[model samples]
Target chain A: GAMSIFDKRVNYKPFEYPEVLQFTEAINKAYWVHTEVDFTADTQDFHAHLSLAEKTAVKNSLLAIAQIEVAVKSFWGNIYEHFPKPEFNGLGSTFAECEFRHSEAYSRLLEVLGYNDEFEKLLDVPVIRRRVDYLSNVLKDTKSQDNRKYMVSLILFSILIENVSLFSQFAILLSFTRFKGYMKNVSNIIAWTSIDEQIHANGGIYIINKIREEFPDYFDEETLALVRETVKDSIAVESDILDWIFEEGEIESIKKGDLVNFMKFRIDESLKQINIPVIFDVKVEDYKALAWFEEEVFANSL
Target chain B: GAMSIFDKRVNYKPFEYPEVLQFTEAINKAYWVHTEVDFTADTQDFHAHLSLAEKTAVKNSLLAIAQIEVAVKSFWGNIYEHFPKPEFNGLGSTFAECEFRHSEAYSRLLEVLGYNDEFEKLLDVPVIRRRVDYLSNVLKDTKSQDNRKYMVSLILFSILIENVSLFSQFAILLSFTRFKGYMKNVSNIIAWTSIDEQIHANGGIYIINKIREEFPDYFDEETLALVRETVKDSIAVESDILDWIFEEGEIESIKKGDLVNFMKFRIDESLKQINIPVIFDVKVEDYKALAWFEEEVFANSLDDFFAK
Candidate 1:
């Protein structure tokens, strides 16, 4: 498929080619998804039925999501400006808008959950704060004109942090949506956010693949090894964090093994999507069941 | 004015304070202003009535406007991310939206004028390229730990570039609107652009004033001197460029004196709005007439312009 959005000069009238038009059309469609979910009902659901631990986990999860969304929104300008092509810049701006909307949606969710104060103090949470700091530092480091480092940061950001890390957290949380009287709207918001993330992840993959093609030396054995290590490290960190959240093992529906398998599957999928060889050896018995999780969340919501 | 948009924590419900609500309301209202102007008619008007020089000036003017609009939209994310407060960031994003729409409008106008090629090559124009390079360099230089330099760049950007430079260009081209069948829609677009510029200028002023209140030393004499020189340098460059634009003196309405006077008046007004003392010594005999230029442009458009 033609990456019309990343072309040197965007063929703005993408309608000339049906596939390009469909590609651009999906971005616009994804944008409207957030507008459909009302977080107000989630607020009522939160105060009415959630246990303290459940509330804590949800609040922490949202805090991390909101914080990362904010960081991504801020980092987008830096990333976009570095792209020499206007088409890439245009897509970056579009992606930046989506990030802002994601941030707004999560912040609104926090407001609805009566955790607006926590939302305000989101960056103060040590783990989330460290993640923001790490990601921001990586972004700043890329400014030094190291394409290898830049490509690595892009992979870590779009694939690892945005795709793998976020989807793993969503998998655990979305599992709770099956319970009657759970935070249905919250789950719906997460589901919408997941759809947006998939698009953003693909955008990241497009850029990463473009870079790989343009500068093959940057993706050599040493560079690929670094990529593998970074993905592995991120996966381990995210796994630990998820474990901490479900440490009590109180959420009966959230199985740690299932969550880890699902995450490994996603990491493998993201690697494949970007044409990078998979580094993780973990295997899932039921890939279809894991894939069904997102579908079920979206299907039940509509 | 309460500066509701700049409040430490924006009172999202600005309606509670009528003035703040009204102030914030205008920004959104101004967003809708672009939808009011259609440039398709201007294409016909350009071909039917405009002389070679008039077409050149109009094309060049739109080219500069479109180029700067693109640069401004791209630069906004850099500026907005540094803002610590969400309210300010919220307003910054809203301002960014306006910039994008402004770029879209001008680009659409270029398409309407059949100058799509020039629009694509906008950055290649040496002066526009130089301006982009200069402004972007200033933005990059301020990325370090110096708040003083950062504040200076912000003022230089929002005040000098967005406000003063754009208005100077508009003042010259908008003069052409008096001719009945010539670039009328282009003038309408400029008028809509002017409204958005005023809001953005006020936003810059708000941020500058906030910085002044927070860090008085940052606005010291040396810094003010630098600002005055920057503003003066920008004014002179814009004046020279505008002169080159109207070198033939074919358009009687665009008196170099009036354009300079209007520009100085604006520079003074911007400094005043930010509560900085005006350092520029140029004067306008009829502030009323110069002000009326924008008003007249908006008024005349309502007859043939609005019904479409």
Candidate 2:
């Protein structure tokens, strides 16, 4: 047993525990895909084949995603001191590192697309500004207080932001990959990002489970209702953003209805994984295109 | 003309700026000495020749410094968002990285000295707890507001916590290195840490100059007075800690008068480098030994060591 900084005796050999071992394995499997690949080919492809609207859509989505990455990285970095256990702190640090890499990857993609100027400008846009402000403010509010609120914020960040909202944009942008002349390299980056987010989401689930097991009293009806509201509200905001982006950018392949269903399915699945009751009752019809689309994107990633 | 995330349309090529270039140079010169040396020989020397009091002093000082390193790392990690400029943020991030390495070096030295368990215990001591609490509280208080307060807090961190206090402890610990059988390997770690601290202190000074140049009105008489108070206050705390550590442990090689004078010289030198008025007028005699100790430690670090 190792004595923690908090003066508690803890089994610091996290590898001995099966769940912690799983997290360690996931962290090991983590790869810096941006380093493994670059976007020169994608840049050429964009110039050679992508229409103006297609280029605009790709740039806009990347900018939004990059800003979100920055906000999340700051969020995790801020909350690092809140984790009492070494393993938990290590996980938070890893998440922060991944978020930094995600931002760097998006920045690199923008550089390749010759949209560096545009990307910098996009960070100042009101919508992007609001998203950054809202996410950071909420995270800062929960810093070093209220375990229930922290858990709620974590769930909102992990499921809503990382999984659902990102995947919604990913689905729309990845739809562009179906066109032979479109940005497959951009899709590859998104694919790698999605894999990282999935692992991050799992880490969050692990922490949430740990919190529940350690402090069962924290999961009262009021807390659960807050959690429910967070998820539902995030879904609503994400749906509206998707609708706005699709309409404004003239993205025809992604339908608002399909994106809403995809988001709901993702939220419900993530909630179920953590044993939280699914609050959204929307049925997701078999969208073979999305299934095939994800498979193709995943294949391209390898 | 690199683009900045801030819409100020300012030139973002920090490397082209002379002051920024100097920081870049200092950062490049930064090296990790721990990897270049180890305590295997020192461990044998400790067992063969050191007195119990000598061993106790070495262990306690290293433990105190390690705790301070941990606190500083956490402090910088907590305040990464407060830096507004990308160049300033980069300096801060680099400073944080160096602080982490410094802690690891101290931790490794403790582990090598066979005091890992005892070091863990020392972290819970009242003296150590108070040091951590005070530095972290001050940094946290200025996390996101008032540029003057933030810059003042940073000076307290860079000059007081890092340069003045750490050099005080280093002066005491490195004096042990004067004896052949004492903790010389530990001194090597401190030397590397000292080099890093000098660079970090320089970075802080650079940022302070920038603050003064960009926002001249921010550094009013009150703010300067607060800055002076922070430096003087930190010096007092560090002086007391040195007295306590040396007195209680019965370590005689490091005199309290010498340590305080050394600390004052360091504080004055740092303030002068940053163009601040030096408040301490202590004359430093026998500073040649301090300079010699630093040179010997720097020589031990290989250039190729940094490539690792």
Candidate 3:
């Protein structure tokens, strides 16, 4: 008799991240306009080509961002393992399985895309070191519920990263689909990663709800505000990192068509589907604002 | 850190069951003999040999068994879902999964063997009917637990059944080395079933030990006698039933080789493994008597043995 989020699948579409919607649509347009052109034969082909150095730099940035997500996942795994309820005991096991599959998926992508073997070894470097540092610092940081709040900060950071990654996959899949092989491989990864994130999101929502129910006095307005601020800051920082990695020129290529519009749509949809928004202090009005951003910026422009 | 049974596997073969050694060995031998046969071919050939009557009979029997097991599993599942404790919760889930897998495995086997199509469509025959008719009747009609001194009859019965099944499967798989494919399937079933039984057995054993520990005053000579009497009667009845089921004439082909010796060794081995004689209120002398009985009657000459 446990209701699950799978119920939403009956009537749901991907959300759009409004800020990047225009750029995504433009990229989609550019790709479709030059669809008949042969890119491999033309060495100087101009469909948003990046220098070798730029590609390596972008890949490195991705590796760094991905590692932070990995650390967040590990932190979630550790805390979930400590939950006393039998209902949640399996969360750690599920997280471990999901993390492994995600790692495998990413590793396969790098292998197939023929990214440098040197860069491939760097995948585990970011997450493992950051996780150890974070845990060490947590001990030195605070007392009482403040320490618990920091753990919750990591959890919320995970939530934000999942949200952004889900959006990124939706955007990337649209452009990747133009190349059938890349689209097929990457889409499979996205599908599984999305499923895992959905589970984690639901789990995160459950943890927040359970804590509120069990210890209402502990989860005060100040604590809630602090958690929300932490999450928003993490999201802002991650968004900026992504912006730098993609750059304005690459961003223009991304916005040319339906892919960016779809991404924008998904961003709005993800916000609407945020069942425990109070945990992050996100209101319906804020979600509606994102929805408006999607409509005004990228609607049909793709 | 949790201790695991797997750690003892290397040294496990020499273990014995003192009291029920003969019965255990007999069961193990039967399993070994069955496992040794070319079941893969037999599995495929079952379709060609099956008459309408045979198919109907097999289907009816299998479906009846499957329905009972599924009901037990479903009941366990409900208990787990409702229970707050981790142990019962884990047990319930594990049992539910076990029965589900068993039910599916049997269903697939029947389908592969080209048995009755209506097998999957029917509701489970009532568990209450089966339990009352089979287990309750035994309890009620016979001298049973009533005459037996202890209230540990139910626990003893469950443990014996579980352990006997485990030993039987182990012996069978060992004997069936030639029929590797068939043995693999049988072993897979046994492995999961063994895990299920071990969990239940471990819980039952723990409870018995805890009760004795806290209230030794209650574990009197009479209570111990009742446990022993119950175990004795239950094993006697089971051995008789198995003897009838695998009579010399039924599987006469088994007389040609070391099959009978293998069976004897298994029964002896099983009896030797039941190290805790006090739990069943029996001493080594009582087990020796059972072993002697196995040696005398079960050791008929191979040439004079019933032939298929």
Better of 1 and 3 by TM-score: 1
lDDT ranking of the models: 1, 2, 3
Models ranked on TM-score: 1, 2, 3
The positional error of residue B228 in candidate 1, measured at the CA in angstroms, is 3.9
Worst lDDT 10-window in candidate 1 chain B: B12-21
For model 2, residues B13-132, the per-residue Cα lDDT tens digits are: 232223644654464455342544667777876777767877666666776777666432445444445554434433444455455456546656766777767765765666666666
Among these predicted structures, which one has the highest DockQ?
A: 1
**Number of clashes recorded per candidate:** 0, 0, 45
CAPRI classification of candidate 1: incorrect
Docking quality (DockQ) of candidate 1: 0.08
Reference-based lDDT, each prediction: 0.63, 0.62, 0.37
What digit string (tens of lDDT, one per residue) describes model 3 on residues B95-183?
Answer: 33334334434444455455444444442434323333444432342223232222253245335433432333233332232222333
lDDT of 1 by residue, A1-302 (tens): 55432234433322222232232335555444344566676676667777776766677667666656643354444554455454454455555555655765665666666766766665565665556555565545455566567667788778765677687667756766774556677787777778778877777777787777666677778877767776776666666667656544556556666767787788888888777799765654655556667675665446
**A135: Cα error in model 3, Å:** 10
- Candidate with better lDDT, 2 vs 3: 2
lDDT by residue (B111-184, candidate 1, tens digit) is: 77777786677667566665666556445544544667778888887777677777766766677776444667
Could you tell me every candidate's TM-score relative to the true structure?
0.71, 0.65, 0.38
